Amino acid sequence: QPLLDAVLANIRSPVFNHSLYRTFVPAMMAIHGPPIVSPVVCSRKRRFEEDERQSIPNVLQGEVARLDPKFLVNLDPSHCSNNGTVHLICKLDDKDLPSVPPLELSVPADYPAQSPMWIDRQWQYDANPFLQSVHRCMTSRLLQLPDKHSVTALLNTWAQSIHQACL
Amino acid sequence: PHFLNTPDKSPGDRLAEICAKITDVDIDKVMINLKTEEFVLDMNTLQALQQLLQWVGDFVLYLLVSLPNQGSPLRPGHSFLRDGTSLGMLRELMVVIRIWGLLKPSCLPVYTATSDDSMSLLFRLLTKLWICCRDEGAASPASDGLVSRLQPKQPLRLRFGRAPTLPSSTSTLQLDGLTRAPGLHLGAYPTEECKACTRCGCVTMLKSPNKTTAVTQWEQRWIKNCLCGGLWRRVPL
Amino acid sequence: DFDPVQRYKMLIPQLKESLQTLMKVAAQNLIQNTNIDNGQKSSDAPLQRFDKCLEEFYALCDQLELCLRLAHECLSQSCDSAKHSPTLVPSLPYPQYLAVIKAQITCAKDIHTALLDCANKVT
């Protein structure tokens, strides 16, 4: 109901801001009498330096941390400074039969995409009969993942397919 | 020199200085004694009376209050000003501002209200302090008791523009290109900075446009060199 | 000589009216100061103080708070003792009531002192 102050403060468009001070500060300083209402001292040069200048996209680092001791990823001759940021060599060292490591070059780690690279498909999979069956079912299974994720999801799918087509 | 006055015998602006030989109390008598006609230069007196003339209106009070507190842990406290000439100029400013407030209702505030004529009492105190300051005499009695009485009007917390120093005493200093190393009233200071805020070399920190109409005399006086602070400086918000 | 609830009921609407007048005088003083400091002279009329209003509003608020605090303390101290003894004043004699209260205070003080001494002797 007492919209008078509201409409006046809204009408007060001009740039000069000293009327509110001279109009209110006397009354408040008379009633409230703090010589230092905020006696804490504040003199701050906030930012000195904040950069490691050696970090790859941190989101990928989280996944490489969450990886199981069975998996292990690395880096090849890397076109992966900051944008691609990955084309790894993940050897699925586990209890069952081993295989050939894929590249899995992923996009920016924000991940509005997935990894799959499929580089060494040409000679590695056609050469062996078992490796040929490994690729077969694994492609069909990867054509099912809705928006797969780079390290954990794709690596686990690869291991599961490798140890499932093994039969 | 702001006076766009009428004809006069000789330099009507000098009468405000010749008014020294006048009565102590009741400036209303002193003004009729000296002159009352040729002291109106512009009907738009609403240019410096409310914004600029509040400075002297508060400084007179802060000087009067600082008198009975000589026991403070400081030689003058904040300021002493026991020379007399400055006090005489202050009294002349009080006379001309009384004339202004008589011409137009935008005078210096009572600083709250309820002075039954706050200007009259302030002028009486100024003159009582000024009489025994004029020409080689002792200084203050009843004045010390009168200044002790505070009306329901007196504010405090005046700007008092000061300048930080550079105390690199005798050994060494180690600064940086940035990241400063810790060791004016014409508006010019809202609660939070929201204008140009063209600082100066020592204390000024005055806005650039000032958002005014006819007080550009001060602006032209300050755009150029200043009180050893002509190096005006721009500082962001 | 009214009840605290009556004082509260008679203070609340005066409080609302004081708040309304406070907002009104604040708006008037602010618009006058702006017209006298930004634009042209238009408000050539004596305005109120806006301080003699806010002080009175704060006084009314504080007095209402004090009345309600007194009523709360009264009801609290009357509730806990009502469940500790029957009503007997012009069902029990006054000297017996005083002796029972003295014995109760003594027993509570003894329990507190014993517990404090044991807690201090524990370490």
Coordinates of C-alpha atoms in Angstrom, one line a residue:
Chain A
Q1 CA 0.0 0.0 0.0
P2 CA 2.7 2.6 0.9
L3 CA 3.9 2.7 -2.7
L4 CA 5.0 6.3 -2.5
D5 CA 8.7 5.6 -1.7
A6 CA 8.7 2.9 -4.4
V7 CA 7.3 5.1 -7.2
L8 CA 9.6 8.0 -6.1
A9 CA 12.7 5.7 -6.2
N10 CA 11.6 4.5 -9.6
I11 CA 11.1 8.0 -10.8
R12 CA 14.6 9.0 -9.6
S13 CA 16.3 8.3 -12.9
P14 CA 18.9 11.1 -13.0
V15 CA 22.6 10.2 -12.6
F16 CA 23.3 12.5 -9.6
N17 CA 23.3 10.3 -6.5
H18 CA 23.7 12.6 -3.5
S19 CA 20.1 13.4 -2.5
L20 CA 19.5 10.0 -0.9
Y21 CA 22.6 10.4 1.2
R22 CA 21.8 13.9 2.5
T23 CA 18.2 12.8 3.1
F24 CA 18.7 9.6 5.0
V25 CA 22.2 9.3 6.4
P26 CA 21.7 12.0 9.0
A27 CA 18.8 10.2 10.6
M28 CA 20.5 6.8 10.6
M29 CA 23.8 8.2 12.0
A30 CA 21.7 9.9 14.7
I31 CA 19.8 6.8 15.7
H32 CA 22.4 4.2 14.9
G33 CA 25.8 5.5 16.2
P34 CA 28.5 3.2 15.0
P35 CA 31.9 4.9 14.5
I36 CA 32.9 1.8 12.6
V37 CA 29.9 -0.3 11.7
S38 CA 32.3 -2.7 9.9
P39 CA 35.6 -2.4 11.8
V40 CA 37.2 -5.2 9.8
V41 CA 40.0 -4.1 7.5
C42 CA 39.7 -5.0 3.8
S43 CA 42.6 -4.3 1.4
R44 CA 42.7 -7.0 -1.2
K45 CA 44.7 -7.6 -4.3
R46 CA 42.7 -10.8 -5.0
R47 CA 44.2 -12.5 -8.1
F48 CA 47.9 -13.2 -8.0
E49 CA 48.1 -16.1 -10.5
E50 CA 45.8 -19.1 -11.2
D51 CA 47.0 -21.5 -13.9
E52 CA 48.9 -24.8 -14.0
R53 CA 49.5 -24.3 -17.8
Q54 CA 50.1 -28.1 -18.0
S55 CA 46.5 -29.3 -17.6
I56 CA 44.6 -31.2 -20.3
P57 CA 40.8 -31.0 -20.0
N58 CA 40.1 -31.8 -16.4
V59 CA 36.9 -33.7 -17.3
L60 CA 39.0 -36.4 -19.0
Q61 CA 41.3 -36.5 -15.9
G62 CA 38.3 -37.5 -13.8
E63 CA 37.6 -40.4 -16.0
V64 CA 41.2 -41.5 -16.1
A65 CA 41.1 -41.4 -12.3
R66 CA 37.9 -43.4 -12.1
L67 CA 39.4 -46.2 -14.3
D68 CA 39.8 -49.7 -13.0
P69 CA 43.4 -51.1 -12.5
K70 CA 42.6 -53.5 -15.4
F71 CA 42.4 -50.7 -17.9
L72 CA 45.4 -48.4 -18.6
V73 CA 45.5 -45.5 -21.1
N74 CA 48.4 -43.5 -22.5
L75 CA 49.2 -41.0 -25.3
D76 CA 50.6 -41.6 -28.8
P77 CA 52.3 -38.8 -30.9
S78 CA 49.6 -36.4 -29.8
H79 CA 47.6 -33.9 -31.9
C80 CA 45.9 -33.4 -28.5
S81 CA 47.2 -30.3 -26.9
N82 CA 43.8 -28.8 -26.0
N83 CA 41.1 -29.5 -28.6
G84 CA 41.1 -33.2 -29.3
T85 CA 43.0 -33.7 -26.1
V86 CA 43.0 -37.5 -26.5
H87 CA 43.8 -40.3 -28.8
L88 CA 44.9 -42.9 -26.3
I89 CA 46.2 -46.5 -26.4
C90 CA 44.1 -48.5 -23.9
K91 CA 45.2 -52.1 -23.4
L92 CA 42.5 -54.2 -21.9
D93 CA 44.8 -56.1 -19.5
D94 CA 42.4 -58.5 -17.7
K95 CA 42.0 -62.1 -16.8
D96 CA 40.7 -63.2 -20.2
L97 CA 42.4 -63.2 -23.6
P98 CA 44.1 -59.9 -24.6
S99 CA 43.4 -57.9 -27.8
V100 CA 44.7 -54.9 -29.8
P101 CA 44.3 -51.5 -28.3
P102 CA 42.1 -48.9 -30.0
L103 CA 42.7 -45.2 -30.4
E104 CA 39.4 -43.6 -29.1
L105 CA 40.1 -40.0 -30.0
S106 CA 37.4 -37.9 -28.3
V107 CA 36.1 -34.4 -28.7
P108 CA 36.3 -31.5 -26.2
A109 CA 35.8 -33.0 -22.7
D110 CA 32.5 -31.2 -22.3
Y111 CA 31.2 -34.3 -24.2
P112 CA 28.4 -33.4 -26.4
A113 CA 29.7 -36.4 -28.3
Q114 CA 31.5 -39.7 -27.9
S115 CA 35.0 -41.0 -28.5
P116 CA 34.9 -43.9 -31.1
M117 CA 37.9 -43.7 -33.5
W118 CA 38.3 -47.2 -35.0
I119 CA 41.8 -46.6 -36.5
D120 CA 43.6 -50.0 -36.5
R121 CA 40.4 -51.8 -37.8
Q122 CA 42.1 -52.4 -41.2
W123 CA 44.9 -54.9 -40.6
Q124 CA 44.3 -55.9 -36.9
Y125 CA 40.8 -57.3 -37.2
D126 CA 40.9 -58.9 -40.6
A127 CA 44.1 -60.8 -39.8
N128 CA 42.6 -63.0 -37.1
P129 CA 39.4 -65.1 -37.0
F130 CA 38.7 -64.4 -33.3
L131 CA 39.6 -60.7 -33.7
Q132 CA 37.2 -60.6 -36.7
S133 CA 34.3 -61.8 -34.5
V134 CA 35.4 -59.4 -31.8
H135 CA 34.8 -56.4 -34.1
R136 CA 31.5 -57.8 -35.4
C137 CA 29.3 -57.8 -32.3
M138 CA 31.1 -54.9 -30.8
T139 CA 30.2 -52.6 -33.6
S140 CA 26.5 -53.5 -33.3
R141 CA 26.7 -53.0 -29.5
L142 CA 28.4 -49.6 -29.9
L143 CA 25.7 -48.6 -32.4
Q144 CA 23.3 -48.8 -29.4
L145 CA 24.9 -46.6 -26.8
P146 CA 22.9 -43.3 -26.6
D147 CA 25.5 -40.6 -26.3
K148 CA 28.2 -42.8 -25.0
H149 CA 30.9 -41.3 -22.8
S150 CA 34.6 -41.2 -23.6
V151 CA 36.7 -43.4 -21.2
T152 CA 34.5 -45.4 -18.8
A153 CA 31.5 -46.1 -21.0
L154 CA 33.3 -46.9 -24.2
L155 CA 36.1 -48.8 -22.5
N156 CA 33.7 -50.9 -20.5
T157 CA 31.6 -51.6 -23.7
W158 CA 34.8 -52.7 -25.5
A159 CA 35.8 -55.0 -22.7
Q160 CA 32.3 -56.5 -22.4
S161 CA 32.1 -57.1 -26.1
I162 CA 35.6 -58.6 -26.1
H163 CA 34.7 -61.1 -23.4
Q164 CA 31.3 -61.8 -24.7
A165 CA 32.2 -62.6 -28.3
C166 CA 34.8 -64.8 -26.7
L167 CA 31.8 -67.0 -25.7
Chain B
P1 CA 34.1 37.7 -8.6
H2 CA 30.9 35.7 -9.2
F3 CA 29.1 39.0 -8.4
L4 CA 27.2 40.4 -11.4
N5 CA 26.3 43.3 -9.3
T6 CA 24.9 46.8 -9.8
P7 CA 26.9 50.1 -9.9
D8 CA 28.8 50.9 -6.7
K9 CA 31.2 53.6 -5.4
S10 CA 34.4 51.3 -5.5
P11 CA 34.5 47.5 -5.9
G12 CA 31.2 46.4 -4.2
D13 CA 32.9 43.0 -3.6
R14 CA 35.3 44.7 -1.2
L15 CA 32.5 45.7 1.2
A16 CA 32.3 42.1 2.4
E17 CA 35.9 42.4 3.5
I18 CA 35.5 45.9 4.9
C19 CA 32.6 44.6 7.1
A20 CA 35.3 43.7 9.7
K21 CA 34.4 46.8 11.7
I22 CA 30.9 45.6 12.7
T23 CA 28.9 44.3 15.7
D24 CA 29.4 40.9 17.2
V25 CA 25.9 39.3 17.4
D26 CA 22.8 39.6 15.3
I27 CA 24.2 39.6 11.7
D28 CA 20.8 40.9 10.7
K29 CA 22.0 44.2 12.0
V30 CA 25.4 43.9 10.4
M31 CA 24.0 43.3 6.9
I32 CA 21.8 46.4 7.1
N33 CA 24.9 48.2 8.4
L34 CA 27.0 47.3 5.4
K35 CA 24.8 46.7 2.4
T36 CA 21.7 44.7 1.3
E37 CA 20.9 45.7 -2.3
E38 CA 23.7 44.8 -4.7
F39 CA 24.2 41.2 -3.5
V40 CA 21.8 39.4 -5.9
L41 CA 23.5 38.3 -9.1
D42 CA 21.4 35.4 -10.4
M43 CA 17.8 34.3 -9.6
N44 CA 19.0 30.7 -10.2
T45 CA 20.8 30.7 -6.8
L46 CA 20.1 26.9 -6.8
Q47 CA 23.5 26.2 -8.3
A48 CA 25.9 26.0 -5.3
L49 CA 23.9 26.9 -2.2
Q50 CA 22.5 23.4 -1.4
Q51 CA 25.4 21.3 -2.8
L52 CA 28.5 23.5 -2.4
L53 CA 27.7 25.9 0.4
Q54 CA 27.0 23.0 2.7
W55 CA 30.7 22.6 3.1
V56 CA 31.2 25.8 4.9
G57 CA 28.0 25.2 6.8
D58 CA 29.4 22.0 8.2
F59 CA 33.0 23.3 8.6
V60 CA 31.9 26.1 10.9
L61 CA 30.2 23.6 13.1
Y62 CA 33.1 21.2 13.1
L63 CA 35.4 24.0 14.0
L64 CA 33.2 25.1 16.8
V65 CA 32.8 21.6 18.3
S66 CA 36.6 21.0 18.1
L67 CA 37.2 23.9 20.5
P68 CA 36.1 22.4 23.9
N69 CA 38.0 19.1 23.1
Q70 CA 41.6 20.3 23.4
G71 CA 42.2 17.3 25.7
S72 CA 42.0 15.0 22.7
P73 CA 45.2 13.0 22.0
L74 CA 46.1 15.5 19.2
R75 CA 47.5 19.0 19.3
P76 CA 44.6 20.6 17.4
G77 CA 42.4 17.6 17.5
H78 CA 41.4 17.8 13.9
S79 CA 42.1 21.5 13.2
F80 CA 42.9 24.5 15.3
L81 CA 42.9 27.6 13.0
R82 CA 43.8 30.2 15.7
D83 CA 45.2 32.8 13.2
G84 CA 42.2 35.0 12.8
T85 CA 42.4 36.0 9.2
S86 CA 40.9 32.7 8.1
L87 CA 38.3 33.2 10.8
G88 CA 37.5 36.6 9.4
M89 CA 37.1 35.2 5.9
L90 CA 34.8 32.6 7.4
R91 CA 32.7 35.3 9.0
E92 CA 32.5 37.2 5.7
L93 CA 31.4 34.0 4.0
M94 CA 28.8 33.7 6.7
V95 CA 27.5 37.2 6.0
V96 CA 27.3 36.7 2.3
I97 CA 25.6 33.3 2.8
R98 CA 23.1 34.9 5.1
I99 CA 22.3 37.4 2.4
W100 CA 21.9 34.5 0.0
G101 CA 19.6 32.6 2.3
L102 CA 17.6 35.8 2.8
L103 CA 17.3 36.3 -1.0
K104 CA 16.4 32.7 -1.8
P105 CA 15.0 29.9 0.5
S106 CA 17.7 27.4 -0.5
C107 CA 20.1 28.3 2.4
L108 CA 22.4 26.1 4.3
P109 CA 20.5 23.6 6.4
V110 CA 19.9 23.8 10.2
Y111 CA 21.6 20.4 9.9
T112 CA 18.6 18.9 11.5
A113 CA 15.9 21.3 12.5
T114 CA 14.6 23.2 15.6
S115 CA 16.8 26.2 16.0
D116 CA 13.9 28.3 17.4
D117 CA 17.7 30.8 13.5
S118 CA 20.7 28.4 13.6
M119 CA 22.7 30.9 11.4
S120 CA 22.3 33.6 14.1
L121 CA 23.7 31.4 16.9
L122 CA 26.5 30.1 14.6
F123 CA 27.4 33.7 13.7
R124 CA 27.3 34.8 17.3
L125 CA 29.8 32.1 18.2
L126 CA 32.0 32.9 15.2
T127 CA 32.2 36.5 16.2
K128 CA 32.8 35.7 19.9
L129 CA 35.7 33.6 18.8
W130 CA 36.9 36.1 16.2
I131 CA 36.9 39.3 18.4
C132 CA 39.8 38.0 20.6
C133 CA 41.8 36.7 17.6
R134 CA 41.9 39.8 15.4
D135 CA 45.1 41.8 16.2
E136 CA 47.7 40.4 18.7
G137 CA 45.4 39.5 21.6
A138 CA 44.7 36.6 23.9
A139 CA 42.0 34.0 23.1
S140 CA 39.4 32.0 25.0
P141 CA 34.7 31.9 29.5
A142 CA 31.1 31.9 28.4
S143 CA 32.2 30.8 24.9
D144 CA 33.5 27.5 26.1
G145 CA 30.2 26.9 27.9
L146 CA 28.2 27.8 24.9
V147 CA 30.1 25.6 22.5
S148 CA 29.5 22.8 25.0
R149 CA 25.8 23.0 24.4
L150 CA 24.6 21.0 21.3
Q151 CA 21.3 21.7 19.7
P152 CA 19.1 18.9 18.2
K153 CA 20.9 19.6 14.9
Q154 CA 24.6 18.9 15.0
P155 CA 26.0 16.3 12.5
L156 CA 29.6 15.1 12.2
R157 CA 31.7 12.9 9.9
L158 CA 33.0 15.5 7.4
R159 CA 35.1 14.5 4.4
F160 CA 38.3 16.4 5.1
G161 CA 40.1 15.4 1.9
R162 CA 43.5 14.0 2.8
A163 CA 46.3 12.3 0.8
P164 CA 48.1 9.0 1.4
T165 CA 51.8 9.4 1.7
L166 CA 54.8 7.4 0.3
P167 CA 56.9 6.5 3.4
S168 CA 59.9 4.7 1.9
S169 CA 61.9 5.9 4.8
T170 CA 65.6 4.9 4.5
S171 CA 66.1 1.3 3.4
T172 CA 64.5 -0.1 0.3
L173 CA 61.1 -0.7 -1.3
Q174 CA 59.7 -3.5 -3.5
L175 CA 56.6 -2.7 -5.6
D176 CA 55.0 -4.3 -8.7
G177 CA 53.6 -3.0 -11.9
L178 CA 50.2 -3.6 -10.5
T179 CA 48.7 -4.9 -7.2
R180 CA 49.2 -1.8 -5.1
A181 CA 51.4 -2.4 -2.0
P182 CA 49.8 -1.3 1.4
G183 CA 52.3 -0.3 4.1
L184 CA 35.4 16.5 -3.6
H185 CA 32.1 17.2 -1.8
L186 CA 30.1 18.6 -4.8
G187 CA 28.3 15.3 -4.6
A188 CA 31.4 13.5 -5.9
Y189 CA 30.9 10.6 -3.5
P190 CA 27.8 8.3 -3.5
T191 CA 27.7 5.1 -1.4
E192 CA 29.3 3.1 -4.3
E193 CA 31.2 4.7 -7.2
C194 CA 28.9 4.9 -10.3
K195 CA 30.5 7.7 -12.4
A196 CA 33.7 8.8 -14.1
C197 CA 35.5 9.6 -10.8
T198 CA 38.5 11.5 -12.2
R199 CA 40.8 11.3 -9.3
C200 CA 43.7 13.8 -8.7
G201 CA 47.2 13.7 -7.4
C202 CA 46.4 14.1 -3.7
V203 CA 42.8 14.1 -2.5
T204 CA 40.3 15.5 -4.9
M205 CA 38.6 12.6 -6.6
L206 CA 36.0 14.8 -8.4
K207 CA 33.7 13.5 -11.2
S208 CA 34.4 14.6 -14.8
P209 CA 31.1 16.0 -16.0
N210 CA 29.7 16.9 -12.5
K211 CA 26.1 16.9 -14.0
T212 CA 25.4 20.6 -13.3
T213 CA 24.3 23.7 -15.2
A214 CA 26.0 26.9 -14.1
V215 CA 28.8 26.1 -11.6
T216 CA 31.3 25.4 -14.4
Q217 CA 33.5 28.1 -12.9
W218 CA 34.9 25.4 -10.4
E219 CA 35.2 22.9 -13.3
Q220 CA 37.3 25.3 -15.4
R221 CA 39.3 26.1 -12.3
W222 CA 40.0 22.4 -11.7
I223 CA 40.4 21.0 -15.2
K224 CA 43.9 22.5 -15.4
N225 CA 46.6 22.2 -12.8
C226 CA 45.6 21.9 -9.2
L227 CA 47.0 22.3 -5.6
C228 CA 50.2 20.5 -6.6
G229 CA 47.8 17.8 -7.8
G230 CA 47.3 19.0 -11.4
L231 CA 48.1 15.5 -12.5
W232 CA 44.4 14.5 -12.7
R233 CA 44.0 10.8 -12.9
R234 CA 41.2 8.4 -14.1
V235 CA 40.3 5.6 -11.8
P236 CA 37.7 2.9 -12.7
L237 CA 34.7 2.0 -10.5
Chain C
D1 CA -4.5 -0.3 33.8
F2 CA -5.4 -2.4 30.8
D3 CA -4.4 -6.0 30.0
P4 CA -1.3 -6.6 27.8
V5 CA -3.5 -8.1 25.0
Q6 CA -5.6 -4.9 25.1
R7 CA -2.4 -2.7 24.9
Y8 CA -1.3 -4.9 21.9
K9 CA -4.6 -4.5 20.1
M10 CA -4.6 -0.7 20.7
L11 CA -0.9 -0.4 19.6
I12 CA -1.0 -2.4 16.4
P13 CA -3.2 0.0 14.4
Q14 CA -1.3 3.1 15.6
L15 CA 1.8 1.2 14.6
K16 CA 0.4 0.7 11.1
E17 CA -0.6 4.4 10.8
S18 CA 2.8 5.5 12.0
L19 CA 4.4 3.3 9.3
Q20 CA 2.2 4.8 6.7
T21 CA 3.0 8.4 7.8
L22 CA 6.7 7.5 7.9
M23 CA 6.6 6.3 4.3
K24 CA 4.7 9.4 3.3
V25 CA 7.1 11.8 5.0
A26 CA 10.1 10.0 3.6
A27 CA 8.7 10.2 0.1
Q28 CA 7.9 13.9 0.4
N29 CA 11.3 14.8 1.9
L30 CA 13.0 12.8 -0.8
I31 CA 11.1 14.3 -3.7
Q32 CA 11.6 17.8 -2.2
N33 CA 15.4 17.2 -1.9
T34 CA 15.6 15.9 -5.4
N35 CA 13.6 18.8 -6.9
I36 CA 15.9 21.2 -4.9
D37 CA 19.1 19.4 -5.9
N38 CA 18.5 18.1 -9.5
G39 CA 15.8 20.1 -11.2
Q40 CA 14.2 23.5 -10.7
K41 CA 12.7 25.0 -7.5
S42 CA 9.2 23.7 -7.2
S43 CA 8.8 22.5 -3.6
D44 CA 9.0 25.9 -1.9
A45 CA 7.0 24.7 1.2
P46 CA 8.1 23.7 4.7
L47 CA 8.4 19.9 4.9
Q48 CA 8.5 17.7 8.0
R49 CA 11.6 16.3 9.6
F50 CA 11.2 12.6 8.8
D51 CA 13.2 11.9 12.0
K52 CA 10.6 12.9 14.5
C53 CA 8.5 10.3 12.6
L54 CA 10.9 7.4 12.5
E55 CA 11.9 7.9 16.1
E56 CA 8.3 7.7 17.2
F57 CA 7.7 4.6 15.0
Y58 CA 10.7 2.9 16.6
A59 CA 9.4 3.9 20.0
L60 CA 6.0 2.3 19.2
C61 CA 7.6 -0.8 17.9
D62 CA 9.8 -1.1 21.0
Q63 CA 7.0 -0.5 23.4
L64 CA 4.8 -3.2 21.7
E65 CA 7.8 -5.6 21.8
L66 CA 8.2 -4.9 25.5
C67 CA 4.5 -5.4 26.2
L68 CA 4.5 -8.7 24.4
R69 CA 7.7 -9.8 26.2
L70 CA 6.2 -8.9 29.6
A71 CA 3.0 -10.9 28.7
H72 CA 5.1 -13.9 27.5
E73 CA 7.3 -13.9 30.7
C74 CA 4.1 -13.6 32.8
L75 CA 2.4 -16.5 31.1
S76 CA 5.6 -18.7 31.2
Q77 CA 6.2 -18.1 34.9
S78 CA 2.5 -18.7 35.6
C79 CA 2.4 -21.9 33.6
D80 CA 5.3 -23.8 35.1
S81 CA 4.3 -23.0 38.7
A82 CA 0.6 -23.9 38.1
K83 CA 1.7 -27.5 37.4
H84 CA 3.7 -27.6 40.6
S85 CA 1.1 -26.7 43.3
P86 CA -2.7 -26.2 43.8
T87 CA -4.5 -22.8 43.9
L88 CA -4.8 -21.4 47.4
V89 CA -5.3 -17.6 47.9
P90 CA -8.1 -15.2 49.0
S91 CA -7.2 -25.4 49.3
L92 CA -4.0 -24.9 51.2
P93 CA -2.5 -22.6 53.8
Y94 CA 0.0 -19.9 53.0
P95 CA 2.7 -21.0 55.6
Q96 CA 2.6 -24.5 54.3
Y97 CA 3.0 -23.2 50.8
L98 CA 6.0 -21.1 51.8
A99 CA 7.6 -24.0 53.6
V100 CA 7.0 -26.3 50.6
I101 CA 8.5 -23.7 48.2
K102 CA 11.5 -23.3 50.5
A103 CA 12.0 -27.1 50.7
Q104 CA 11.7 -27.4 46.9
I105 CA 14.3 -24.7 46.4
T106 CA 16.6 -26.3 48.9
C107 CA 16.3 -29.7 47.3
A108 CA 16.9 -28.4 43.8
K109 CA 19.9 -26.5 45.0
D110 CA 21.2 -29.6 46.8
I111 CA 20.8 -31.7 43.7
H112 CA 22.6 -29.1 41.6
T113 CA 25.4 -28.7 44.1
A114 CA 25.9 -32.5 44.4
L115 CA 26.0 -32.9 40.6
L116 CA 28.5 -30.0 40.3
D117 CA 30.8 -31.3 43.0
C118 CA 30.8 -34.8 41.5
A119 CA 31.5 -33.5 38.0
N120 CA 34.4 -31.4 39.4
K121 CA 35.8 -34.4 41.3
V122 CA 35.5 -36.5 38.2
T123 CA 38.5 -34.6 36.8

